[PDB]
Every structure is written in C-alpha cells, then in structure tokens.
A paper describes a structure:
The 3.5 Å resolution structure of [name] in the larger [name] nanodiscs in [name]/[name]+ shows an open permeation pathway in all 3D reconstructions, with Cα r.m.s.d. ~0.5 Å to C18/[name]+ and ~0.4 Å to [name]/[name]+MSP1E3. Thus, in [name] an open groove is not sufficient to enable lipid scrambling and nanodisc size does not influence the conformation. In the [name]/[name]+ maps we resolved several lipids near the dimer interface corresponding to D2, D3, D6, and D7 (in MSP1E3 map) and to D2 and D6 (in [name] map) seen in the C18/[name]+ map. Reconstituting [name] in membranes formed from lipids with longer acyl chains dramatically inhibits scrambling although the groove remains open.
[name] scramblases dissipate the plasma membrane lipid asymmetry to activate multiple eukaryotic cellular pathways. The [name] superfamily is comprised of Cl- channels and dual function scramblases/non-selective ion channels. Our results show [name] thins the membrane to enable scrambling and that an open hydrophilic pathway is not a structural requirement to allow rapid transbilayer movement of lipids. Scrambling by the [name]’s is modulated by two signals, binding of [name]+ facilitates opening of the groove while the properties of the membrane determine whether the scramblase can thin the membrane enough to enable lipid flipping.
Numbering used by the authors:
A (entry chain B), B (entry chain A): 13 to 260, 267 to 312, 317 to 396, 419 to 453, 488 to 660, 701 to 724
Amino acid sequence: NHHVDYVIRFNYGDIDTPEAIKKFEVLLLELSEVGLQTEVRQGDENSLFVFVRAASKKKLKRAVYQSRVRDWLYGVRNTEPEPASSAKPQSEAERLLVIYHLITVPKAEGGAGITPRHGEWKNVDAIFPLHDEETNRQCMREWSKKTFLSTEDLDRIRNTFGEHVGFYFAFLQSYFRFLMFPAAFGFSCWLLLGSFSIIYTVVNCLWCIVFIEYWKRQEEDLSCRWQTKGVSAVHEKRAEFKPEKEIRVRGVFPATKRMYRQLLQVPFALLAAVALGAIIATCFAIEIFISEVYKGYLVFIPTILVSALIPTMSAVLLTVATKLNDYENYETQDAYKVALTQKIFVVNFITSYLPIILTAFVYVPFASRIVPYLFSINPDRLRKQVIYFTVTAQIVGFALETIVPFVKQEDEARFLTRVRNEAELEDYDVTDDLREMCIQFGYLALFSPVWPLVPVSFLINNWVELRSDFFKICVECKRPWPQRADTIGPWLDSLGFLSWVGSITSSALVYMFSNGHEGPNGEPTTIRCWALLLTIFFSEHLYLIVRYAVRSALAKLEPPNTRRERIERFMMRKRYLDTVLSPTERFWMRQRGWKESAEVGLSLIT
Amino acid sequence: NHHVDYVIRFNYGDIDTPEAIKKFEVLLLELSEVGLQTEVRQGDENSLFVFVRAASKKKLKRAVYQSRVRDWLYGVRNTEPEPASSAKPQSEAERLLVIYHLITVPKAEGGAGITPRHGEWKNVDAIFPLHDEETNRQCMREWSKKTFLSTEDLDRIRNTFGEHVGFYFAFLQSYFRFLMFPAAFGFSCWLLLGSFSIIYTVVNCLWCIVFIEYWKRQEEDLSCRWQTKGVSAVHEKRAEFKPEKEIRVRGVFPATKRMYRQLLQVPFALLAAVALGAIIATCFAIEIFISEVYKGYLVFIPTILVSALIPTMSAVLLTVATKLNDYENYETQDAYKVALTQKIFVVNFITSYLPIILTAFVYVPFASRIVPYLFSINPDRLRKQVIYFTVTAQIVGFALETIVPFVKQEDEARFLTRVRNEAELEDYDVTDDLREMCIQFGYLALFSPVWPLVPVSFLINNWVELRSDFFKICVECKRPWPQRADTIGPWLDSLGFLSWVGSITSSALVYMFSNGHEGPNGEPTTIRCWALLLTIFFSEHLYLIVRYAVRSALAKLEPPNTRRERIERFMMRKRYLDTVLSPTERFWMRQRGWKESAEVGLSLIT
Ligand SMILES: [Ca+2]
Ligand SMILES: [Ca+2]
Ligand SMILES: [Ca+2]
Ligand SMILES: [Ca+2]
C-alpha cells in the first residue's frame, strides 16, 4: 500500500477555481499542523484525492499515547497507559483509528477539523482507508474451509476492519453456532411429527430465550475482552449538532426538549404503520381476488405492484425518518445511528412480517366470511409463503447481496489505479447486515411451527452468509474505518421484541391449526376466542417467567474477561495507593488492662 | 453515654465455669489485640456484658483511614482517601460501623473474630450499640410537626442508624409524597363518579408506573449521594458459609451447584401456595356457608380459625424457608437476607391478597353456581373487605405495631440500668417495615377501583407510620448498627411485580363490574370470557408499553449526584496521571512540504 493510511477525496467539480484552491490550501494547512504527511495525486476526471500518513514515528507515538490516555481517563481501558516511547500501535485498527481521529475530531481537542461534506468544505466526499488485500485474501481462503471460526479469527476481524465489524462477525458466528439445536430439533420434528407441533413450539421459544440471554452475556464478555466496554463515554461528536448554550465548551442541549421532539416518533410510527398496512393489505386482497375468485398472464400484477411500490414508499419513509432525525439534535454519531435504526425497524417489521400475518391470521381463519363481500381456501398458502420467505427469498437476497454488485463492477501506475477503482465502491454499513440477521431471527421466532425446516435452511444460509459478508467487505466495498462499539446496538432489544411477539404468534398458530394444516378452513365458527386468548395469555406469561429465570441464572455467572476487568480496576487503585499517598473518664479508670477485666469477670462469674 | 460505643452481651448461664472463663479470656484477648478498650460490668442475673470503645484517638484514626481505603479500592467512594492524621470520623455512623467491623470481621483481614452466637463462642447473644437519646428525642419532637421531611432530616437519619434505615425512611417519604396525586384523584373520583371507574383505573396504573420508575431513579441518585453505590463489593461475609475449596483464601463455592440448590425454590413455592390456598379457601367457604346459608355466636368460628391457624402455618413455612436458605450457602449476609426475603414474599403475597381475590373473583362471579353443591349474593362483600383491609386492618396493624410493645415494656448507677433495660428490647429489622409498605402498595395497586378512598387512607396512615416507625426505632428497640446499602433490596422488583399484577386484576375488576357494584350477581352467564380476556390482554400490553416509555424517558435524565460521581472518577484518574507517570518511500519524495502539494493541486485543477 506504500504506507498510505487514508485517502481524502477532495472535489473541485461544482466549486469554482479560486474558492476550490482556497479550500484546498486550508485543507492542507490543518493536515500539516496536526502531524500528517500529505501527498496529493490526480483522482478521477473531476476529483483530486490526498493521501495521508503519519509524518514521523515519534509524532505517531505521541499521538497514539494521547489516544490511550483519553480512553483510560474516560473509563474504557481500566489499566495504566504505556509510556509514549514504548507505545507502538497494536494493530492496523489502532493506527487507522488514531489517524481518523486526528483527521476528523475538531480543533478544540487537538485534531484537525475535517468533517466530510457537511459544514465548511462540502467537497470532501469520503475519507476511506485502503484495503490490506494479501491479508484479506489469505483470511478468505483460510476460513472458506473451516466449519467454525476461532477466537483468533475473530481477533483478526477485529484487528482489520475494527470492532464494529468484529462484533457483527462474532454475532453471526454465535448465531450460526446456536442454530444447531433448533436445526436438529426441527429436522427431528419435521421427520417424525407434522407441522404445528407443541413440543417444537416450546423448544423453539426456549431456544430463543437461551440464545438472547447468552448473547447478552457474550456481548458483555467480548466488550470486556476487546477493551471497549464503556466506549459510550468516548463516542465521536458530530458537526450537525446545533447547541443551545455554552458552559465550560461542550455546547449543551436540554434533554427534555429532545424528549419533546422524540415524541414525534409515535405519529411517524402510526403514519408508517397505517400507510404500509394499507398498501400491503390492498395488494394481498387484490392477489387473493384475482388468483382465487375470477389468468396465467394476469396473476402477475400484484407481485410487480409490490416490487415497484414498496421500495418507493420505504424510501419516502426513510426520507421522513431522516428529516425527523435531524430535527432531534443527537450530539454524537452513535445516538443518531441508533435513533435512525430504531425508526427504520418499524418499517422493516411491517414490510417483513405483514404478508405472513395476513395470510396466517386474516386469510386462513376468515376468508370466506369476507370473499362474498368482494370459499374452500387453499390450505397450503401459509406453508408456501413460509417456504418462499425462508428459502427462495433468502436465495434471491444472497443473489442481490453479492452476485449483482460483482457483475455491476510509472512505479505508482498500478497503485494509482487500484486506489482509483477502490474509490468507486460502496460505503459499507454493518446495520444492513445486522438487519438481515435480525429479520431472519424474526422469521424463525414467529413462523417456525409452520414448516419446521426453517432453522435448517437458516443454518445453511448463515454458514454461507458469514463468508459472503466477509467477501463483500474485502472485495465489493471500501474498507470501513475501525469504528469501536460495545454491543451490536439496538438490535439486542429488537431481537428480544422479535422473540417476544414470536411467543404470541406461534402459540396462536398452534392453537388454531391443531386440526390439520388447513387449520380453520375458511369461515371461522369453530375457533373459540375464549380458548384462543387463554393460550396466548398463558404462553406469554410462561415465556416471561422462563425468560426471567434464564436471565437471573446467567447474571450470576461472571465471565472471565469481566472478572478480569473488575480486578484490574482494583489493581490500578492499589498501585496508585503505593506509588503515591505515602465523671465520664472515671468510668474507664477501674480496669486498665485486659487481665484485670478478666479478673472482674471471674470474680463476677464465681 | 460515657463514650461507650458497643455492648457485647457475654453469657455464662448454660456454659460451665472453666469453659466460660476460657471463652471470656479468649474474647478479651482479641479485643485488646485489635485496638479496643474493654470494661466489663455486671449484666443480668445470668449474663455479663463488656463495653467496647476505641482505645486511642490515633488507633481510631488509623482504623478509620483503613476503612476508607478499602471501599475506595473496591469502587464505592470514587475519590481519594483523606490522610490518616486528618481523617476524623464524619458522624456516629462511620465510627460505629468501623468499630463493628473491628469487632466482627474475621482475623484474616485484621479485625477480631467475634461472630455472635454462631461458630466458636455460642454465648455472645448480641452486639448492640447504645441510643443517642437526646438527639433522638430532639428529632422526634422536631419533625412530629412538619408536613414533609427535608434532605437534612434524611441525612440525620443517615448519620444516626446508618444507611439501611435511611433508605427506608427516604422511601417512605417519597411514597407518602407521591400518594398525593392518587389521593386527590381518588377523592375526586369517589365524590364525582362511582366505584369501578375507568379513568381512575388508568390514572392509578400510570401513577404506579411513574412512582416505580422515579424511585429507581431516586435510589440511584441517593446511593450516589451517600457514597454507597457499589456497596455490593464490600458486603460482610458470614461464618455460616461452608466453602468447597481454597484458592488464593476466600473459600470459593461453585455457583452452578448453588443454582441447582436454588431450584428447590419451585417445590417450596408450590407447597406454600397449595397449603396456604387450601387453608384460606377452606376458611372462606366455611365462612360463606355458615354466614349466608344456614348464628351471631356462630359467625365467629372462621375468624378465630385464621387468627389461630395462619400464623402457625406461616411460622412452619418460615422454618422450612430458613432450613432451605441454610442449604444454599450464600457467602455474604446480604445475599442470605435477600434470599430469605424473596422466599417469604410468596407467603406474604398469598396470605395478604387471597381473601380479596376469592371474594372478588371466585365469590362475586360464581357463588350460586357453587352454593347448591354445598343465591342472591351480598353485593357489598367486596367493598366491605377492601374497606376492612385498607382501614381497620391498618388501624389494628398500627396498634399491634407500636402500642402493644410499649405496654409490654454510684455515678454509673443510672447508666448501668439504662443499658440493662435497653438490653431487653427487640432487635430491629427494617425488612418488616419495608414488607408493610410493599403489601400496602400491593393493596393500592390491585384493589383500588373498589372504593377509591384507598389512597386517601394510605396517605394518612403513611404520614402517621413514618413518625411511628421512628418512634419504634428510637424507643422500643435497640439501636441498629449502621448497615450500609444501595437499594431497598428485592422490594423494588417486588413493587414492580405487585403493580404488574395490579394491571391485570384492576382491569378484570372494571370489566366485570361495569354493570353496577353487584357486578356479575351470583351465577355468571352474562360475563363474556371472550371480552374478559381481551381487556386483560390489551391492558397488560398497554401497561408494558407505557412502562417501557417511562423507563426510557427517565433513563435519559442523569441525576446530579450520578453526574457528579461519574466526573470525580475522571478527576481521580486525571490526578493520578499528573502526580505520577511523568520504491515505497520514493512515492513520498515528490512533494516535501504542504506548499508544493498545494502547487500540484493548483496545477492539476487548472
Ligand atoms: Ca442472506
Ligand atoms: Ca449478510
Ligand atoms: Ca401501619
Ligand atoms: Ca411501619
């Protein structure tokens, strides 16, 4: 890579020439005044990117010791900072993270001011590091053959690509690994019993409880292991944040006003729910009427209708959620990303689980009681849609995930072109992959009693998807900068909610389908709503009781890295304490020493 | 008090004379070898108590600096220990707590070995401090007149009687204070509307949610204020603990074996539930048949039956719970007390809320459908039992709390008799008073839609009960030793569970009684169990949604003491850091300084 850390794509297309060269000179002054060596090279037809390297080894050592000092002070490291003359960077992640903080974190603390495209420049499109292609191809061809990734492999996806990708890859490993028990139980139940089986439903809800509690425990242990536990204290501030007052330099904003702006989440959620429910239910009723009332060239209208109407409405809701998320201030980038993710999860929940719920609950149980207003319903509609969403939708999702973007794409002559064709790749966001895994866990927690080969299909697809996501990161994207994290984000409570409703939906399914597969064949006159709500009541409360039992069991087992990170915070204070910090009386005149008190005791006992 | 800190009642009644004097000499040796001045005086007819004072001011200063060092090291204090020559004890609580640690915490760390009555002595009945009667009477007559206790008053009940009593008194103050909104709303609803009113039920569930979340916030703030946040790390070990192995000196026990012994909680809970349910339901059916089927001298059998059969069964269940709580090891005293409290809360729940539930749910809705097997039921049975349990049971509880134990009870001549008549008082346990307040909150959260003057009665009784509990502590008991805590214990999650079921029970009540007070008059043929379970379903899920909203709102508002205790843990580390700890290169040979890079930039832009 010729020691090049970062590439800063300065643009000059839409900006006139003297303003562009003034912006360029002010960009290159703050890079030399922060300790970074710059080398400008010709970019695209209308761009000009500047390479960035730490200027000297002593400047890099002084800049990486003052980045270990800061997160030791803010309670992340819990052990003393190594001295600066012996403080070499541990890996590529620490070096690239220090260089990115020197580039982006503003001039109040000591870094440069470069915020990409937002506030003063509006020209620097991206600040991307370069790939380590030999190590990437070695890791790809090394663990394209192993059945399970080791902790050394997870530490290599920590040392490259940072910790925010390493937490996702450890989550995917600990999710493919824990899929083996419901995979074996689902194969056993689909071979032995039929679908809608009670022991498979209880086993599946117990497995979701156990997996969620074990991954909360493993997240705490892994954030203690990777020295990134309290990384919320050193989160990167943002320049879009507009403060009210200034109390000494941080620019505070009253959090109650942000709560009152956060209460717009409920009308946005109601609008998104009503609009997406109207579109999906209208498409579903159109498909039902056209396909089973009134043809082979006329069955294809509602599928093209959702394929050309759902992503447009979802992009409109994404725009409205972004415009509302800029209204609330959110001084850090992590709070903004978590708020945007919690906003789009409602759209993702409705878009992902509304067809299976109308077909499973509104379609199978009523249908005839409706169709005359517009029956001998198709009994395999629910099984066919679960089979579709689990197998064929995952096949086409893997297709449009990694095959379609691959088909879509002197001495420095090869390097200046490999950076140029790495400049056009896609910026990698790990929330999309966490979204895919969480929607998949939602399918497995909600509609697994229909067709219990769903965990088997998810096991095979997860083993393919781990390697495919690593191939996408190393090949089809720019390198993500080493972002740190402690959890996977709001996806933890998303997974808890997903399983939470799964405990209601699967129990309602195994109640109302315990008469066959056709379940409540059309018109519902048999289903007894006094027996449909009692099983939901008792199953949800047994779910909550067993979940409380498992969380109270797993809380009392301290993991080794947490038990080693609450001991070093005693050892550091013990080392601090050794390095520095160096009438009435006539009642007590009778018995002086402890021998005469024993004499009065023996004299009073005898 | 003539500077006397503690009184250690050595017994010699059942022990023969040479063994008693050997135990006495070994008791008095370890007191002089730990730094405490002893003065033995004649006790009761068959006891002999030894007074204990710190021997010298320098020894007390060295013993109180090494007790600030320890909880600074274990992460409780978060600020540097003051030097020992200027480390005077802050109040009576710190001095008496240091003297109690020197008396009781065993010889591995530096204290003496005196465990009361357990392991080697089996004679020292109690180690009680002496009352500060002038300050106690001054505080009693000072805040027997004020409407609300100030934070200085709460800090005085912290400085005397420690922090475990101060947390309860702050809880009772913050519970009497937050009773004013449901008191005013219940008076407004009982004057304007009738009983079983929907807006009063929604307001009451919202008030329970808000009060529980605010008291969790205030508990965190108060444990940060009183410098006792992480006091779980310095909990007092116990001598009943029997360890498996010894790894360097703590005596570890495998926690999975304690989990497997903790799984006996479910058969004990089933046994207690079935037995107490059988006794209470048999008494209730006997009372119903005798009082309303078949007399004035014959109505009094079932009341004497519970008054002579419920406390005997509860004492049997207390004995079984103690024998099971000694089976599980529980190395600390706080874990043992929390486990015993969580065991007796099931007995307290069933004994406290089973008559109102059978009368409200089993009696009002069926009754005739039952009585022929043994109707025009009495409509005011539920209102009369709620009125009884809220008003008259609280009056007789205040009576048997403080009036009956008061009627039941040379130069050193007055002092040796005031200690002698303080030796016979009752050892004060704050879990009984927290149990009374939590059972009262359970009544208010479960059965307030019946007769909505229940929060008004609870407001008056709580203002009386705060002063009466302080009178009981200062007058009718020995002084409790200054035990530290951070929460009130498991009563927090007890209160959450209490309100949790209240959201089901009150909604079922206001469904099935929205036809009058008689509700489902006898035989149930009107109540529609498809409408009884939908309101329970929707009300419980709206309860959980609003509770999640309130906890997510109150989590984002940092209290001032927590925001000052996460800043001093930056300041201490910042003070530590200042007191101590002092081919490839041909690509980077084109442009040396940032001026020539700007020259290449202008040459490439132009
Ligand atoms: Ca996929
Ligand atoms: Ca993926
Ligand atoms: Ca009382
Ligand atoms: Ca009391």
